[PDB]
mmCIF file of C-alpha atoms in Angstrom:
data_model
loop_
_atom_site.group_PDB
_atom_site.id
_atom_site.type_symbol
_atom_site.label_atom_id
_atom_site.label_comp_id
_atom_site.label_asym_id
_atom_site.label_seq_id
_atom_site.Cartn_x
_atom_site.Cartn_y
_atom_site.Cartn_z
ATOM 1 C CA UNK A 1 61.399 14.951 178.264
ATOM 2 C CA UNK A 2 62.876 12.030 180.675
ATOM 3 C CA UNK A 3 66.295 11.793 181.676
ATOM 4 C CA UNK A 4 68.560 9.075 183.240
ATOM 5 C CA UNK A 5 71.034 9.607 185.770
ATOM 6 C CA UNK A 6 74.439 9.681 183.536
ATOM 7 C CA UNK A 7 73.070 12.858 181.186
ATOM 8 C CA UNK A 8 74.613 14.239 177.882
ATOM 9 C CA UNK A 9 72.659 15.007 174.786
ATOM 10 C CA UNK A 10 69.289 14.178 175.463
ATOM 11 C CA UNK A 11 66.792 16.616 174.599
ATOM 12 C CA UNK A 12 67.370 19.440 172.122
ATOM 13 C CA UNK A 13 64.543 21.507 171.554
ATOM 14 C CA UNK A 14 63.851 24.469 168.569
ATOM 15 C CA UNK A 15 62.016 27.653 168.778
ATOM 16 C CA UNK A 16 60.698 29.506 165.647
ATOM 17 C CA UNK A 17 59.278 32.656 164.802
ATOM 18 C CA UNK A 18 56.951 34.430 161.869
ATOM 19 C CA UNK A 19 56.992 36.800 159.565
ATOM 20 C CA UNK A 20 53.513 39.352 159.238
ATOM 21 C CA UNK A 21 53.029 41.346 156.187
ATOM 22 C CA UNK A 22 51.065 44.456 155.081
ATOM 23 C CA UNK A 23 50.651 47.018 152.352
ATOM 24 C CA UNK A 24 49.426 50.257 151.709
ATOM 25 C CA UNK A 25 47.595 51.093 148.781
ATOM 26 C CA UNK A 26 46.322 54.098 147.100
ATOM 27 C CA UNK A 27 42.736 55.175 146.521
ATOM 28 C CA UNK A 28 40.822 58.594 145.181
ATOM 29 C CA UNK A 29 37.975 59.989 143.037
ATOM 30 C CA UNK A 30 37.011 63.656 141.242
ATOM 31 C CA UNK A 31 34.530 65.745 140.423
ATOM 32 C CA UNK A 32 34.232 68.623 137.952
ATOM 33 C CA UNK A 33 31.591 71.021 137.244
ATOM 34 C CA UNK A 34 30.830 74.362 135.265
ATOM 35 C CA UNK A 35 30.635 77.721 136.396
ATOM 36 C CA UNK A 36 27.254 77.962 134.091
ATOM 37 C CA UNK A 37 25.802 74.763 136.142
ATOM 38 C CA UNK A 38 26.054 76.768 139.376
ATOM 39 C CA UNK A 39 24.850 79.901 137.826
ATOM 40 C CA UNK A 40 21.373 79.051 135.971
ATOM 41 C CA UNK A 41 20.561 76.060 138.192
ATOM 42 C CA UNK A 42 17.242 75.470 139.786
ATOM 43 C CA UNK A 43 18.935 75.421 143.386
ATOM 44 C CA UNK A 44 21.305 77.619 145.235
ATOM 45 C CA UNK A 45 22.937 75.385 147.793
ATOM 46 C CA UNK A 46 24.153 72.768 144.904
ATOM 47 C CA UNK A 47 27.487 72.732 145.727
ATOM 48 C CA UNK A 48 26.924 72.599 149.614
ATOM 49 C CA UNK B 1 64.688 78.640 138.258
ATOM 50 C CA UNK B 2 60.977 77.694 138.152
ATOM 51 C CA UNK B 3 59.940 74.935 140.609
ATOM 52 C CA UNK B 4 56.119 74.086 141.287
ATOM 53 C CA UNK B 5 56.903 71.003 144.150
ATOM 54 C CA UNK B 6 53.320 68.691 144.287
ATOM 55 C CA UNK B 7 50.619 69.782 145.978
ATOM 56 C CA UNK B 8 48.298 72.548 146.071
ATOM 57 C CA UNK B 9 49.775 73.898 142.942
ATOM 58 C CA UNK B 10 50.409 71.510 140.078
ATOM 59 C CA UNK B 11 46.621 70.674 140.317
ATOM 60 C CA UNK B 12 44.282 71.028 137.027
ATOM 61 C CA UNK B 13 42.175 69.009 134.843
ATOM 62 C CA UNK B 14 45.451 66.986 133.585
ATOM 63 C CA UNK B 15 45.478 65.765 137.106
ATOM 64 C CA UNK B 16 43.386 66.827 139.799
ATOM 65 C CA UNK B 17 45.521 64.684 142.228
ATOM 66 C CA UNK B 18 48.762 66.686 142.618
ATOM 67 C CA UNK B 19 51.471 64.272 142.528
ATOM 68 C CA UNK B 20 53.919 65.654 139.895
ATOM 69 C CA UNK B 21 56.698 68.021 140.573
ATOM 70 C CA UNK B 22 58.828 70.593 138.041
ATOM 71 C CA UNK B 23 61.855 71.901 137.829
ATOM 72 C CA UNK B 24 63.064 74.376 134.923
ATOM 73 C CA UNK B 25 66.074 75.619 134.108
ATOM 74 C CA UNK B 26 66.366 78.142 131.575
ATOM 75 C CA UNK B 27 68.998 81.229 130.452
ATOM 76 C CA UNK B 28 70.902 83.268 127.732
ATOM 77 C CA UNK B 29 73.533 82.545 126.060
ATOM 78 C CA UNK B 30 75.855 84.685 123.573
ATOM 79 C CA UNK B 31 79.251 85.990 122.455
ATOM 80 C CA UNK B 32 80.769 88.167 120.805
ATOM 81 C CA UNK B 33 84.961 87.540 118.959
ATOM 82 C CA UNK B 34 86.261 91.201 119.106
ATOM 83 C CA UNK B 35 90.015 90.504 117.753
ATOM 84 C CA UNK B 36 89.644 86.946 116.057
ATOM 85 C CA UNK B 37 93.396 87.400 115.303
ATOM 86 C CA UNK B 38 94.264 87.305 118.445
ATOM 87 C CA UNK B 39 92.544 83.575 118.759
ATOM 88 C CA UNK B 40 94.861 80.907 117.771
ATOM 89 C CA UNK B 41 94.030 77.457 117.489
ATOM 90 C CA UNK B 42 96.256 74.152 116.057
ATOM 91 C CA UNK B 43 94.930 70.971 115.703
ATOM 92 C CA UNK B 44 96.413 67.737 115.171
ATOM 93 C CA UNK B 45 96.632 63.868 115.489
ATOM 94 C CA UNK B 46 97.183 61.961 119.098
ATOM 95 C CA UNK C 1 43.687 48.030 130.812
ATOM 96 C CA UNK C 2 43.176 48.795 134.704
ATOM 97 C CA UNK C 3 45.392 51.444 135.855
ATOM 98 C CA UNK C 4 47.689 54.360 134.612
ATOM 99 C CA UNK C 5 50.725 52.319 135.342
ATOM 100 C CA UNK C 6 49.506 49.863 132.606
ATOM 101 C CA UNK C 7 49.735 51.736 129.755
ATOM 102 C CA UNK C 8 53.190 53.516 130.771
ATOM 103 C CA UNK C 9 54.268 50.107 131.377
ATOM 104 C CA UNK C 10 53.264 48.955 128.228
ATOM 105 C CA UNK C 11 54.921 51.963 126.440
ATOM 106 C CA UNK C 12 51.922 53.257 125.545
ATOM 107 C CA UNK C 13 51.458 56.756 126.159
ATOM 108 C CA UNK C 14 48.039 59.129 127.169
ATOM 109 C CA UNK C 15 46.841 62.795 126.538
ATOM 110 C CA UNK C 16 44.608 64.355 129.491
ATOM 111 C CA UNK C 17 41.392 64.942 127.325
ATOM 112 C CA UNK C 18 39.982 68.761 128.499
ATOM 113 C CA UNK C 19 36.360 69.231 126.737
ATOM 114 C CA UNK C 20 35.018 66.376 128.904
ATOM 115 C CA UNK C 21 35.853 62.750 129.702
ATOM 116 C CA UNK C 22 39.347 61.049 130.935
ATOM 117 C CA UNK C 23 42.231 60.131 129.287
ATOM 118 C CA UNK C 24 42.979 59.276 125.382
ATOM 119 C CA UNK C 25 45.878 56.377 125.172
ATOM 120 C CA UNK C 26 48.165 56.834 122.074
ATOM 121 C CA UNK C 27 50.337 54.181 120.484
ATOM 122 C CA UNK C 28 53.687 54.363 118.273
ATOM 123 C CA UNK C 29 51.664 53.882 114.800
ATOM 124 C CA UNK C 30 48.552 55.762 116.454
ATOM 125 C CA UNK C 31 50.786 58.682 117.106
ATOM 126 C CA UNK C 32 52.914 57.982 113.465
ATOM 127 C CA UNK C 33 49.604 57.926 111.819
ATOM 128 C CA UNK C 34 48.342 60.976 113.721
ATOM 129 C CA UNK C 35 51.628 62.631 111.995
ATOM 130 C CA UNK C 36 50.817 62.459 108.358
ATOM 131 C CA UNK C 37 50.361 65.276 105.919
ATOM 132 C CA UNK C 38 49.299 63.835 102.937
ATOM 133 C CA UNK C 39 48.909 59.890 102.387
ATOM 134 C CA UNK C 40 53.141 59.361 101.785
ATOM 135 C CA UNK C 41 53.452 59.502 105.729
ATOM 136 C CA UNK C 42 50.950 56.877 106.862
ATOM 137 C CA UNK C 43 52.810 53.174 107.803
ATOM 138 C CA UNK C 44 53.223 50.457 105.720
ATOM 139 C CA UNK C 45 49.989 49.222 107.619
ATOM 140 C CA UNK C 46 47.624 51.877 106.544
ATOM 141 C CA UNK D 1 62.392 67.595 113.479
ATOM 142 C CA UNK D 2 65.049 69.249 115.398
ATOM 143 C CA UNK D 3 62.976 72.378 116.894
ATOM 144 C CA UNK D 4 59.863 72.982 117.955
ATOM 145 C CA UNK D 5 59.468 75.273 115.411
ATOM 146 C CA UNK D 6 60.352 72.987 112.886
ATOM 147 C CA UNK D 7 56.875 71.672 113.491
ATOM 148 C CA UNK D 8 54.793 74.674 113.739
ATOM 149 C CA UNK D 9 57.135 76.016 110.001
ATOM 150 C CA UNK D 10 55.960 72.597 108.718
ATOM 151 C CA UNK D 11 52.337 73.102 109.511
ATOM 152 C CA UNK D 12 51.914 70.133 111.745
ATOM 153 C CA UNK D 13 50.302 71.165 115.205
ATOM 154 C CA UNK D 14 51.864 70.104 118.325
ATOM 155 C CA UNK D 15 49.785 68.857 121.232
ATOM 156 C CA UNK D 16 51.346 68.214 124.828
ATOM 157 C CA UNK D 17 51.355 64.989 126.700
ATOM 158 C CA UNK D 18 50.955 65.027 130.249
ATOM 159 C CA UNK D 19 51.242 61.502 132.306
ATOM 160 C CA UNK D 20 54.438 60.029 130.136
ATOM 161 C CA UNK D 21 56.507 61.834 127.946
ATOM 162 C CA UNK D 22 55.311 64.727 125.529
ATOM 163 C CA UNK D 23 54.797 66.996 122.346
ATOM 164 C CA UNK D 24 53.194 64.072 120.359
ATOM 165 C CA UNK D 25 52.526 65.740 116.589
ATOM 166 C CA UNK D 26 49.491 66.039 114.783
ATOM 167 C CA UNK D 27 49.132 66.550 110.785
ATOM 168 C CA UNK D 28 45.700 67.170 109.142
ATOM 169 C CA UNK D 29 45.503 63.871 107.712
ATOM 170 C CA UNK D 30 46.377 62.403 110.887
ATOM 171 C CA UNK D 31 43.921 64.562 112.865
ATOM 172 C CA UNK D 32 41.354 63.718 110.016
ATOM 173 C CA UNK D 33 41.823 60.052 110.998
ATOM 174 C CA UNK D 34 41.888 61.194 114.616
ATOM 175 C CA UNK D 35 38.640 63.049 114.222
ATOM 176 C CA UNK D 36 36.674 60.291 112.552
ATOM 177 C CA UNK D 37 33.632 58.389 114.309
ATOM 178 C CA UNK D 38 32.513 55.168 111.703
ATOM 179 C CA UNK D 39 34.108 53.854 108.681
ATOM 180 C CA UNK D 40 32.701 56.761 106.438
ATOM 181 C CA UNK D 41 34.386 59.601 108.447
ATOM 182 C CA UNK D 42 38.007 58.544 107.252
ATOM 183 C CA UNK D 43 39.654 59.797 104.914
ATOM 184 C CA UNK D 44 40.160 58.650 101.074
ATOM 185 C CA UNK D 45 43.302 57.374 101.577
ATOM 186 C CA UNK D 46 42.994 54.912 104.657
ATOM 187 C CA UNK E 1 31.410 71.908 113.177
ATOM 188 C CA UNK E 2 30.698 75.643 114.814
ATOM 189 C CA UNK E 3 31.149 75.348 119.202
ATOM 190 C CA UNK E 4 32.425 73.338 121.232
ATOM 191 C CA UNK E 5 29.336 72.228 122.765
ATOM 192 C CA UNK E 6 28.484 70.769 118.989
ATOM 193 C CA UNK E 7 31.148 68.420 119.753
ATOM 194 C CA UNK E 8 30.324 66.690 122.952
ATOM 195 C CA UNK E 9 26.621 66.753 121.674
ATOM 196 C CA UNK E 10 28.120 64.501 118.981
ATOM 197 C CA UNK E 11 29.532 62.259 121.213
ATOM 198 C CA UNK E 12 33.360 63.481 119.688
ATOM 199 C CA UNK E 13 35.354 64.499 122.521
ATOM 200 C CA UNK E 14 38.517 67.045 122.030
ATOM 201 C CA UNK E 15 41.757 67.910 124.090
ATOM 202 C CA UNK E 16 43.957 71.436 124.201
ATOM 203 C CA UNK E 17 46.827 72.109 122.178
ATOM 204 C CA UNK E 18 49.880 73.572 123.943
ATOM 205 C CA UNK E 19 52.505 74.812 120.627
ATOM 206 C CA UNK E 20 50.733 76.324 117.992
ATOM 207 C CA UNK E 21 47.095 76.649 119.248
ATOM 208 C CA UNK E 22 43.675 74.842 118.262
ATOM 209 C CA UNK E 23 41.609 72.306 119.634
ATOM 210 C CA UNK E 24 42.282 68.824 118.141
ATOM 211 C CA UNK E 25 39.072 66.778 118.075
ATOM 212 C CA UNK E 26 39.239 62.980 118.938
ATOM 213 C CA UNK E 27 36.757 60.648 116.986
ATOM 214 C CA UNK E 28 34.994 57.039 117.909
ATOM 215 C CA UNK E 29 37.205 55.078 115.575
ATOM 216 C CA UNK E 30 40.171 57.592 115.871
ATOM 217 C CA UNK E 31 40.886 56.516 119.069
ATOM 218 C CA UNK E 32 41.841 52.599 118.767
ATOM 219 C CA UNK E 33 43.135 53.621 115.438
ATOM 220 C CA UNK E 34 45.248 56.329 117.666
ATOM 221 C CA UNK E 35 46.071 53.613 120.109
ATOM 222 C CA UNK E 36 47.009 51.090 118.441
ATOM 223 C CA UNK E 37 50.452 49.310 119.194
ATOM 224 C CA UNK E 38 51.013 46.925 116.191
ATOM 225 C CA UNK E 39 49.071 46.509 112.747
ATOM 226 C CA UNK E 40 46.864 44.071 113.974
ATOM 227 C CA UNK E 41 45.792 46.374 116.395
ATOM 228 C CA UNK E 42 43.657 48.469 114.090
ATOM 229 C CA UNK E 43 39.911 48.586 114.372
ATOM 230 C CA UNK E 44 39.682 47.520 110.586
ATOM 231 C CA UNK E 45 41.019 50.321 109.783
ATOM 232 C CA UNK E 46 43.426 48.942 106.665
#
């Protein structure tokens, strides 16, 4: 950006920015069981 | 009024993850006209 | 059909199953065939 | 059908629907079609 | 069918009934019939 002795409109610059985008999702899972499967099971700490 | 907010309640085999709410309004209405001759009504066209 | 929104967005409805399994999806004929007493109330299709 | 008793009085059964709306109506024929495994177990009419 | 276990062993699945009582049982061929959105969506029903 060299300027002469006179001056004036000689060197215009610019500035830019940027945007960052993030998203949030939902997740999950489940498991079911019956009382008989906990009572008459070969083990005793199946739930644990 | 019966309100069940999502959370520990409203979880079941329908939805293990409680993500539904509920609010029900129930009432009981009934009326008796003792003296219908004291009730006056006129019909007309505007 | 990927998510529970897919059935809902499509207009197809889903019922929670009790005995074992996930959900049963119902379409409007599938509901209307479902609500038939005798041969008369099935769709034109069946 | 106007009221919930109409389905009961008619003889159709009524299942509550969770995810979307509710109250799908089942008739004996519709159930028997709905209870079919292979082409042999559907009713005569279909 | 006698008991709920006989259902699951057969592979037939069943749902609960709120307004009227009973265990409506879903078959194999019933589901896609029950899930159809249009006449082309039946699984070779009619």
